[PDB]
Design an enzyme around this catalytic site. Structure first.
Site, short mmCIF file in Angstrom:
data_model
loop_
_atom_site.label_atom_id
_atom_site.label_comp_id
_atom_site.label_asym_id
_atom_site.label_seq_id
_atom_site.Cartn_x
_atom_site.Cartn_y
_atom_site.Cartn_z
N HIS A 55 0.81 -1.21 0.00
CA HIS A 55 0.00 0.00 0.00
C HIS A 55 0.88 1.30 0.00
CE1 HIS A 55 -3.19 -2.60 2.49
NE2 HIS A 55 -3.16 -2.94 1.20
N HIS B 249 -6.71 -0.26 3.32
CA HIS B 249 -6.10 -0.75 2.13
C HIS B 249 -6.39 0.30 1.04
CE1 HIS B 249 -6.51 -4.10 4.85
NE2 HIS B 249 -6.34 -5.06 3.96
C1 LIG Z 1 -0.17 -8.29 -4.22
C2 LIG Z 1 -0.95 -6.92 -3.99
C3 LIG Z 1 -2.00 -7.14 -3.08
C4 LIG Z 1 -2.77 -5.93 -2.76
N1 LIG Z 1 -3.86 -6.16 -1.93
C5 LIG Z 1 -4.79 -5.13 -1.83
C6 LIG Z 1 -6.13 -5.12 -1.34
O1 LIG Z 1 -6.87 -6.12 -0.86
N2 LIG Z 1 -7.07 -4.08 -1.19
C7 LIG Z 1 -6.63 -2.77 -1.52
O2 LIG Z 1 -7.38 -1.80 -1.39
N3 LIG Z 1 -5.26 -2.68 -2.03
C8 LIG Z 1 -4.43 -3.79 -2.24
N4 LIG Z 1 -3.25 -3.49 -2.89
C9 LIG Z 1 -3.26 -1.81 -2.93
C10 LIG Z 1 -3.80 -1.36 -4.27
O3 LIG Z 1 -3.80 -2.43 -5.28
C11 LIG Z 1 -2.87 -0.24 -4.86
O4 LIG Z 1 -2.57 0.58 -3.78
C12 LIG Z 1 -3.63 0.55 -5.89
O5 LIG Z 1 -4.48 -0.29 -6.73
C13 LIG Z 1 -2.75 1.27 -6.83
O6 LIG Z 1 -3.43 2.40 -7.56
P1 LIG Z 1 -2.73 3.28 -8.75
O7 LIG Z 1 -3.81 3.80 -9.57
O8 LIG Z 1 -1.87 4.18 -7.87
O9 LIG Z 1 -1.64 2.26 -9.39
P2 LIG Z 1 -1.77 0.95 -10.33
O10 LIG Z 1 -3.08 0.29 -10.17
O11 LIG Z 1 -0.54 0.26 -9.81
O12 LIG Z 1 -1.53 1.45 -11.81
C14 LIG Z 1 -0.45 2.04 -12.44
C15 LIG Z 1 -0.54 1.42 -13.86
O13 LIG Z 1 0.56 2.13 -14.48
C16 LIG Z 1 1.22 1.19 -15.41
N5 LIG Z 1 2.50 1.91 -15.70
C17 LIG Z 1 3.48 2.20 -14.79
N6 LIG Z 1 4.45 2.87 -15.45
C18 LIG Z 1 4.10 2.99 -16.75
C19 LIG Z 1 4.74 3.54 -17.85
N7 LIG Z 1 5.95 4.11 -17.71
N8 LIG Z 1 4.13 3.45 -19.03
C20 LIG Z 1 2.98 2.83 -19.19
N9 LIG Z 1 2.36 2.25 -18.17
C21 LIG Z 1 2.88 2.34 -16.92
C22 LIG Z 1 1.22 -0.12 -14.60
O14 LIG Z 1 1.57 -1.23 -15.51
C23 LIG Z 1 -0.22 -0.10 -14.04
O15 LIG Z 1 -1.14 -0.68 -14.96
C24 LIG Z 1 -2.45 -4.65 -3.34
C25 LIG Z 1 -1.42 -4.56 -4.30
C26 LIG Z 1 -0.71 -5.73 -4.57
C27 LIG Z 1 0.49 -5.51 -5.51
#
Ligand SMILES: Cc1cc2nc3c(=O)[nH]c(=O)nc-3n(C[C@H](O)[C@H](O)[C@H](O)COP(=O)(O)OP(=O)(O)OC[C@H]3O[C@@H](n4cnc5c(N)ncnc54)[C@H](O)[C@@H]3O)c2cc1C
Length: 565
Positions: free
Chosen positions: A501, A545
């Site tokens: 997280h 989370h």
């Molecule tokens: C194993 C795991 C278990 C988890 N368990 C939970 C849970 O039960 N409940 C909860 O609320 N949270 C959980 N999390 C927390 C939650 O998933 C994340 O905090 C949140 O989804 C991330 O949001 P975001 O929009 O910041 O990033 P992301 O959803 O990480 O998205 C960023 C996107 O950017 C893409 N990207 C990155 N750099 C580039 C680039 N240079 N060019 C093109 N594409 C790029 C990536 O491939 C990805 O698709 C978990 C995460 C993991 C890894």
């Protein structure tokens, strides 16, 4: 060309893409580094989520630097690399945070638009409650009034029961001073023991691609490219007196030729807490000294880039149990797995719809705890948590494989209010090399002190009458004596990991402030035409989370973008 580009296709990026394209005269291009999420069983059946990452084509395959707090260990740092981002590999648990988290985000940015009351409108856009897979009576497991009924993401109560459920509930009566029941975290008051709610609808994952990108895919003004890693934000001119960053360069893989595209209006970074700072650094936006040490010329000097990283550290612990109803054998015996796969495929019911945990405990240190003689309270406020405890019907440990023999339940803690802060930095200026991720876990006396207390709490909980015929013994003999602090601290530093997280590496702050990466409307400080909407902007670990809060950011951010059209 397009009005907007669309840096990653993740938990928050898909909200922005789908919301902006509701207006048929606004075109958006989404660039996603990863592959499709379509017909990936491990990303549809809830129970199979833990297997998907870290070591795989759906993961960025990041690790931390060596942690002295963890006796020298580096740990895996999984992140999703596909449509839906980490929302396609996560554990689906859903909650928003405390009222104190959001009022603190408002107080620290000067913008009342963040802020518990003003954010509730986005919970309603974001979610709808649907039936649990087993269709049980959910009466008294949540409060319908505090959740959405029409929004995009399907949420529900646990879809498969476990032998822990009645025993957790009985402990909330036997031990109610410490472990009282909480009817719903959506009240903004996280403390106590509540039933899990998860982004699952009809026995499968409800992710940001299923909920936003897929319905929006028939739109001619929305365009989605996969296998498209953005390798540089390009300084495209000077507008409004600042360097303009409205072009990007993207490639399929290392060594391939790069494509250039421009946005007429803004580039939106939604690459997440790791992806976003590193991309900024790679484009010359960051600490000048660090950028030049790796051969990059600084265009905008901002040392806050990649700093102020907070995360929830994880503590795992398994216990042998007298039971034949734990989920361990689904993972060891192929006949059992296939019978439950058949039921899941045909009816969307049974064990594969089950969650990581059906119940969650949110806890504080005593008001007169000795640690407060030398630390001010790091909790978001007096109604917020110091730690969490998660009760699972199987073995759960991120770094130790499930044993071949034994039935287990696990008691996993997350440290919700850390004092530690770390950073993300470049090792080289090659966009395909991995970054240096240094969370600085257990680097303060508050953090280790709290985890020791968390273990004593776990042990008072499992010593109740409800557990007498069920818990046999800890898997690790250092968990036998709750008075032996040396043995407990040894256990913690050998076992602690992360619960995934991270926030804070592109923190929002007041306009003009001398820390932070973005303004409160999420515009990059020192730049024109670049906006950040993802986990990186949250300046403090929430009581949650992080999918729940990150969807709210995705939602306010889409509005913030429309307000400047
Ligand atoms: C194993 C795991 C278990 C988890 N368990 C939970 C849970 O039960 N409940 C909860 O609320 N949270 C959980 N999390 C927390 C939650 O998933 C994340 O905090 C949140 O989804 C991330 O949001 P975001 O929009 O910041 O990033 P992301 O959803 O990480 O998205 C960023 C996107 O950017 C893409 N990207 C990155 N750099 C580039 C680039 N240079 N060019 C093109 N594409 C790029 C990536 O491939 C990805 O698709 C978990 C995460 C993991 C890894």
């Amino acid at each position: 060309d397009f009005d907007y580009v669309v840096v990653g296709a993740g938990n928050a990026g898909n909200v922005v893409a789908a919301r902006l394209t509701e207006d048929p005269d606004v075109s958006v291009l989404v660039l996603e580094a990863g592959v499709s999420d379509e017909n990936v069983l491990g990303a549809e059946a809830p129970l199979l989520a833990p297997g998907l990452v870290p070591n795989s084509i759906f993961d960025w395959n990041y690790t931390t630097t060596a942690q002295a707090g963890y006796n020298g260990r580096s740990i895996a740092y999984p992140r999703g690399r596909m449509l839906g981002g980490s929302s396609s590999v996560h554990y689906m648990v859903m909650m928003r945070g405390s009222t104190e988290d959001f009022d603190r985000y408002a107080a620290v940015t000067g913008d009342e638009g963040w802020n518990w009351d003003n954010i509730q409108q986005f919970v309603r856009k974001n979610e709808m409650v649907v039936p649990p897979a087993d269709n049980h009576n959910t009466s008294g497991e949540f409060i319908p009034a505090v959740h959405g009924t029409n929004g995009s993401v399907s949420i529900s109560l646990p879809g498969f029961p476990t032998p822990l459920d009645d025993r957790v509930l009985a402990t909330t009566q036997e031990q109610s001073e410490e472990f009282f029941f909480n009817p719903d975290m959506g009240t903004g008051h996280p403390l106590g023991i509540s039933w899990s709610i998860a982004s699952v609808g009809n026995g499968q994952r409800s992710s940001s691609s299923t909920a936003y990108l897929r319905p929006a895919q028939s739109r001619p003004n929305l365009s989605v490219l996969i296998n498209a890693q953005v390798t540089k934000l390009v300084n495209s001119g000077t507008t409004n007196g600042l360097p303009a960053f409205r072009c990007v360069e993207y490639a399929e893989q290392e060594g391939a030729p790069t494509t250039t595209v421009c946005a007429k209006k803004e580039v939106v970074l939604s690459a997440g807490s790791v992806g976003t700072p590193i991309l900024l650094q790679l484009s010359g936006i960051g600490d000048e000294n660090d950028l030049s040490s790796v051969g990059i010329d600084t265009i905008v000097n901002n040392p806050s880039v990649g700093r102020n990283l907070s995360d929830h550290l994880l503590l795992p612990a398994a216990f042998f149990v007298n039971s034949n109803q734990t989920f361990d054998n689904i993972f060891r015996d192929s006949s059992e797995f296939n019978v439950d796969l058949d039921q899941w495929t045909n009816t969307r019911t049974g064990p594969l719809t089950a969650l990581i945990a059906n119940h969650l405990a949110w806890l504080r240190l005593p008001s007169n705890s000795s640690i407060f003689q030398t630390f001010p309270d790091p909790a978001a406020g007096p109604n917020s948590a110091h730690w969490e405890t998660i009760f699972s019907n199987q073995w759960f440990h991120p770094a130790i494989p499930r044993p071949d023999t034994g039935s287990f339940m696990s008691v996993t803690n997350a440290l919700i209010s850390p004092v530690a802060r770390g950073d993300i930095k470049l090792a080289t200026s090659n966009p395909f090399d991995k970054p240096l991720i240094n969370p600085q876990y257990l680097s303060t006396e508050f953090d280790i002190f709290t985890m020791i207390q968390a273990v004593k709490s776990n042990l008072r909980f499992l010593s109740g009458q409800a557990w007498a015929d069920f818990v046999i013994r800890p898997f690790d003999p250092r968990l036998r004596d709750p008075t032996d602090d040396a043995a407990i601290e040894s256990y913690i530093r050998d076992n602690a990991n992360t619960i995934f997280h991270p926030v804070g590496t592109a923190s929002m702050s007041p306009r003009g402030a001398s820390w932070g990466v973005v303004d409160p409307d999420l515009k990059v400080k020192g730049v024109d035409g670049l906006r950040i909407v993802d986990g990186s902007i949250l300046p403090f670990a929430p009581n949650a989370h992080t999918q729940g809060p990150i969807y709210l950011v995705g939602k306010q951010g889409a509005d913030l973008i429309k307000a400047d059209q």
